[PDB]
């Protein structure tokens, strides 16, 4: 850290204690976050930020460099052919993909499946020139359980069928049981901590994303405070997916908020499931049919 213009040994200690350990968190910080450190004047705060930006090289980019930026994105297989396809390859990192369906349409199932697929090295698609094996080594997932529907059996099961060790998934998956929007949001914010503890967090799950809010703010008259709270949570989720190049997933049950990829899932006949991609930045709307069996998502 002392590499940063103005930053010395003492200051370095302050910054590391306030959460700012790496450059990108400093290069993308606001002169406010940093000054609120006390001892970190608005003067030095601007200087270290101008600097951290430079080192990380956050300027204007054009031509072929734009493709280089877009290749730092890796994807995760959902274990469905039609779904990965509709996904344009699979679940993207640096973005928040949301599955919003009806009761028992499969949201939680897709969530579990992903935790498992993360421990299957072959299920992460990327360009090795922009994303080295080391970056995706010992990936771990954080599962913020809102409804209390995390089921370790179901993990073990999906693993066994995938041909991998379920105990290995359980060992690399952090589950946090949230009972309300405060715990939910906080757990989310506390993820940056597991990463500084040396945890290669690459998958984040919020099941559900919109449950606690609806319950805490049913009053459709105090909607403001709510939508603010929820939107601020999303901002954290996105920033989190960008800076730590990791896939973030959220579920939303339905019979407004930011989410870079929007899916609407519904039950079919029996196993059959219909996932409808109605919103995304570069892909056309489309439907993906898959199913859920003892093996998880398949076809
Ligand atoms: N071990 C299993 N073997 C076969 N099917 C299973 C298994 N576990 C769960 N399912 C299927 O998963 C369905 C439930 O899907 P689920 O992931 O709970 O949807 P959901 O989006 O979470 N619904 P909700 O939480 O109520 O909003 C069941 O009704 C089963 O068909
Ligand atoms: Mg993004
Ligand atoms: Mg659910």
Swiss-Prot record:
Database matches in InterPro entries: AAA+_ATPase (IPR003593), DNA_recomb/repair_Rad51_C (IPR013632), DNA_recomb/repair_RadA (IPR011938), DNA_recomb/repair_RecA-like (IPR016467), DNA_repair_Rad51/TF_NusA_a-hlx (IPR010995), Hlx-hairpin-Hlx_DNA-bd_motif (IPR003583), P-loop_NTPase (IPR027417), RecA_ATP-bd (IPR020588)
Keyword line: ATP-binding, DNA damage, DNA recombination, DNA-binding, Nucleotide-binding
Domain of life per record: Archaea
Binding site for ATP: 101-108
GO process terms (BP): DNA recombination; DNA repair
Pfam families documented for this protein: HHH_5, Rad51
UniProt xrefs under PANTHER family: MEIOTIC RECOMBINATION PROTEIN DMC1_LIM15 HOMOLOG, RECA/RAD51/RADA DNA STRAND-PAIRING FAMILY MEMBER
Function: Involved in DNA repair and in homologous recombination. Binds and assemble on single-stranded DNA to form a nucleoprotein filament. Hydrolyzes ATP in a ssDNA-dependent manner and promotes DNA strand exchange between homologous DNA molecules.
Family the UniProt entry places it in: Belongs to the eukaryotic RecA-like protein family.
Protein name: DNA repair and recombination protein RadA
The encoding gene: radA
